[PDB]
Amino acid sequence: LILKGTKTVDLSKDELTEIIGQFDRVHIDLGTGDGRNIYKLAINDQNTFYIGIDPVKENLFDISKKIIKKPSKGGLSNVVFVIAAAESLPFELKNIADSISILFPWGTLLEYVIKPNRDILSNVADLAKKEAHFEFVTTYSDLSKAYFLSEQYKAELSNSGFRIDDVKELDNEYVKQFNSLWAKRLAFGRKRSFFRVSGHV
């Protein structure tokens, strides 16, 4: 299931493969939100096909309507919005991404990353190609770098297919570069700690 403007339509595996054809890389943003972050990534790199996934189609309507417009009007040819959840990812996305990101998650997705939920993370790892980079950027209260650096957390992620190569604590200034309304709120509000766990799959 993908969005064509405000309408939900079916995209087959063969159709997806055809679209991917004009691009050298594929990036998946899980729990993409309002689509503004992915829109910015896509506008700055036309050799990567961007796939934004979120179970809430309603919040993607504005940007979904924008990408279908003509190029001169803000339209993009390297973005697709998939309506799905981490617990039930589309089989068409298996082994397709060069990179996967989960940015400023909330709700169940945040817990799957922080706990972490090994089975769910395993499903997310299945979306990656043999290669593949990953990036999880989280924040809770306005846990800690130590937690994400612990052997237990590293082992749990490794079991799911994620090999941590770096853990960095980021600040509000860093988040000011993102365009989603949510990211702006997090960046402009009280001082908050953000953590990026990144590596390869």
Ligand X SMILES: Nc1ncnc2c1ncn2[C@@H]1O[C@H](CSCC[C@H](N)C(=O)O)[C@@H](O)[C@H]1O
Residue stretches of the annotated binding site for S-adenosyl-L-methionine: 31, 37, 54, 86-87, 103-108, 180-182
Site for ligand X in 125-184 (CB under 6 A): 180, 182-183
Q: Least distance (Å) from ligand X to the CB of residue 88?
A: 8
Residue 177: count of CB within 10 angstroms of its CB: 10
Give 92: exposed, middle or buried? Use CB within 10 Å, 0-12, 13-18, 19+. Answer: middle
Q: Of residues 2, 16, 28, 86, which one binds ligand X by CB under 6 A?
A: 86
Bridge partners (DSSP) listed for residue 53? 30, 82
Q: Position 189: which residue type? A: G
Q: Cβ of residue 169: shortest distance to ligand X, in angstroms?
A: 18
Pairing assessment for the beta strands 128-138 and 194-200 based on DSSP bridges: antiparallel
Instruction: Kindly state whether residue 121 participates in binding ligand X, applying the rule CB under 6 A.
Output: no
One symbol per residue from 19 to 58: x for binding ligand X (CB under 6 A), - otherwise; what is it?
-----------xxxx---x----------------xxx--
Start-end of H helices in 68-144: 108-114, 118-125
- How many CA atoms within 13 Å lie on the side-chain side of 154? 11
Q: Which residues are annotated as a binding site?
A: 31, 37, 54, 86-87, 103-108, 180-182
Give least dist CB 164 to ligand X, A: 20
Q: What are phi and psi of 17, to 5 degrees?
A: -60, -40
Task: Note whether 168 and 196 are within 8 A (CB).
Answer: yes
Residue among 37 and 78 whose Cβ is closer to ligand X: 37
* Residue of 107, 130, 152, 173 interacting with ligand X (CB under 6 A): 107
Place of tokens 């961007």: 50
Task: Enumerate binding residues for ligand X (CB under 6 A).
Answer: 30-33, 37, 54-56, 85-87, 103-109, 180, 182-183
